[PDB]
Amino acid sequence: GSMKYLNVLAKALYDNVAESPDELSFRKGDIMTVLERDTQGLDGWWLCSLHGRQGIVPGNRLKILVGMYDKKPAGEFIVTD
């Protein structure tokens, strides 16, 4: 239905440390779900979710992996045109 998320994940190829709580701290080998891309108007920065938080992550350090095919059916949203 309407208002569905991407529900694709990506594996970190490189590690980082986050200086802000709005930024995600991840390490190489870890996997996070990508919710949307270019989330701050910055090309290549994706809004990912990991460890109970969501935050900005440089997608240039991630590799997209389809880890889930089954997912919520969603669709619970108002009508839109």
UniProtKB/TrEMBL annotation:
Entry coiled-coil feature ranges: none
All residue ranges annotated as the SH3 domain in the record: 6-67
Subcellular location: Cell junction, Focal adhesion; Cell projection, Axon; Cytoplasm
Family membership: Belongs to the CAS family.
The protein, known as: Breast cancer anti-estrogen resistance protein 1
Name of encoding gene: BCAR1
